[PDB]
Amino acid sequence: KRDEKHRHVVNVVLELPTEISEATHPVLATMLSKYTRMSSLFNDKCAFKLDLLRMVAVSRTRR
Amino acid sequence: MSLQFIGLQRRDVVALVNFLRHLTQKPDVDLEAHPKILKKCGEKRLHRRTVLFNELMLWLGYYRELRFHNPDLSSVLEEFEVRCVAVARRGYTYPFGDRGKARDHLAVLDRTEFDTDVRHDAEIVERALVSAVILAKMSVRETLVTAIGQTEPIAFVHLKDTEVQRIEENLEGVRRNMFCVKPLDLNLDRHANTALVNAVNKLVYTGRLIMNVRRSWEELERKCLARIQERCKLLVKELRMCLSFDSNYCRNILKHAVENGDSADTLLELLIEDFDIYVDSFPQS
Amino acid sequence: THCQENSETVALCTPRIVIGNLPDGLAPGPFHELRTWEIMEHMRLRPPP
Structure with missing residues (x-):
């Protein structure tokens, strides 16, 4: 059940390609668990993209 | 509000909740005035990252107990x-x-x-x-x-x-x-x-x-704000030693200035909201 | 000039040793520079190194 809600974010919201599976990106698992709690602003497809984008910069910075 | 901790035993976490109800009643209202509460931190018993982070939940919550x-x-x-x-x-x-x-x-x-x-x-x-x-x-x-x-x-x-x-x-x-x-x-x-x-x-x-x-009031409230600023910069020196998503994530949490209580009051409600994600960065057990 | 020793306004006196202690309204900054050339001219350093 709860796993099906993650597919709604990967598909209907983020429009991520299936090649970019949630299992394929290990650090993504920490983020989608928080986004599922926020039912609000599902209509805004773009805001989740910019947020998922910037968090990767937190993951990858030698400096 | 609902403070959360790392390596503390459940018997000790309940004792910290008892500190809120007793705060109006106990003589000498200061965290420094109750050294045994400082000995609940588990210092040396746990890793230095836990020793600093464990106090941060108290000083942010002790400042919350004062405002309320x-x-x-x-x-x-x-x-x-x-x-x-x-x-x-x-x-x-x-x-x-x-x-x-x-x-x-x-x-x-x-x-x-x-x-x-x-x-x-x-x-x-x-x-x-x-x-x-x-x-x-x-x-x-x-x-x-x-x-x-x-x-x-x-x-x-x-x-x-x-x-x-x-x-x-x-x-x-x-x-x-x-x-x-x-x-x-x-x-x-x-x-x-x-x-x-x-x-x-x-x-x-x-x-x-x-x-x-x-x-x-102000002489103590200025002190509690000064204490959080010291614990944070010492925490950054240890978190910097390791590079990870959750490890770099904690450094962003400390970027907000502790100066002025509302800047710190938002920090406490924020840190409780995201406890699940950075918890892996701190060694335990 | 007067000072403020406790419960008092006692007078104070202090020599002005160097010539530069004089007030700018009595010792203008243009004056000290043009005066400085008088000794370099006495030192025969009209064209300074």
Whole structure:
């Protein structure tokens, strides 16, 4: 059940390609668990993209 | 609010919740005044990252416990206006040897009022008293300061020594616990001095009281903010040693300035919201 | 000039040792520079190194 809600974010919201599976990106698992709690602003497809984008910069910075 | 911790045992986490209900009751209200609570941190027993982070939940929550109970002198603060109005009423009838020098002090005594702002609550009391203490010495013709830069200290005028120890001891108990104070200490005699000094000593007691409640607040509140700033920068030095998503994530949490409580009050509600994601960064068990 | 020893306004006195202690309204900054050339001219350094 709860796993099906993650597919709604990967598909209907983020429009991520299936090649970019949630299992394929290990650090993504920490983020989608928080986004599922926020039912609000599902209509805004773009805001989740910019947020998922910037968090990767937190993951990858030698400096 | 709902503080959360790492390596603490559940028997200790419940004890920290007990600290909230007992905070109004316990003598000496300070985290430094209860060293055993500091020994609940588990220092040396756990990793240094846990030793610093464990205090951060307390100092943010201890500052939250201070704001919620709130200083509340307003029930007494209105009485301060009445006694100041009483000195204003009896201060005109009393003869003086130089009324022009004294009447100007009475005008500043009338202007004093408290604004909604809390930072001004201490300074307003000081000028209201300095205008009176200079006036009270004139009633007994006591010598008063003349050199510039030598403002008179606020103090009681002409009182029995047995009265002094009973009333000064209350002032030490105001710093001990500002949360619960009452003006029960009143015993001025009609025979002593004059009706002005009886109106003044009742005013000076409340006048010191508004400051002793306020100065006990800001001097501690400035300290708790200073403590969080030290623990954070020490935490960054250790988190920097390892690079990870959750590890770099904690460094972003500390970027917000601890200065001003609202900047830190948002930090506590935020950190509780995201406890699940960065928890892996801190070693445990 | 007077100072502020405690409960007092006692007078104070202190020599002005160097010529530069004089007030700018009595010792203008253009004056010291043009005066400085008088000694370099006495040192025969009209064209300074």
